[PDB]
Structure 1
Amino acid sequence: RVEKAKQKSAQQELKQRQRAEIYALNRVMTELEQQQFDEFCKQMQPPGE
């Protein structure tokens, strides 16, 4: 029947959602890493003279 047509559309939409979540997660993880490294650098900034 045409179950395969609706099942393929379903597969494509969920593929697109899963990929969009992966990339939204990738962006967030990148910002966390940057944030944590920045805190680490702030902590050891030398006082100079």
Structure 2
Amino acid sequence: QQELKQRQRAEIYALNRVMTELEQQQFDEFCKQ
């Protein structure tokens, strides 16, 4: 179903943004240590 695909895609991209910011933050904190 197309509507489910679109819903999943929207959540995937919200989640990817969150995980990308997390990886950037963790990278910076590791450089500080």
Percent identity of the aligned residues? 97
Structure 1: 4+ residue segments shifted above 4 A: none
Structure 1 runs not aligned, ≥5 long: 1-10, 43-48
Task: Tell me how far apart the structure 1 counterparts of residues 11 and 21 of structure 2 sit (CA, whole Å).
Answer: 15
Q: What root-mean-square deviation, in Å, do the aligned CA atoms of Structure 1 and Structure 2 show?
A: 3.2
Match of 2:10 among 7, 20, 30: 20
Structure with the largest fraction of helix: 2
Alignment TM-score, normalising by the size of structure 1:
0.58
Structure 2 runs not aligned, ≥5 long: none
Greater Rg, structure 1 or structure 2?
A: 1
Cα deviation for residue 17 of structure 1 reads 0.5
2:24 — aligned with what?
34
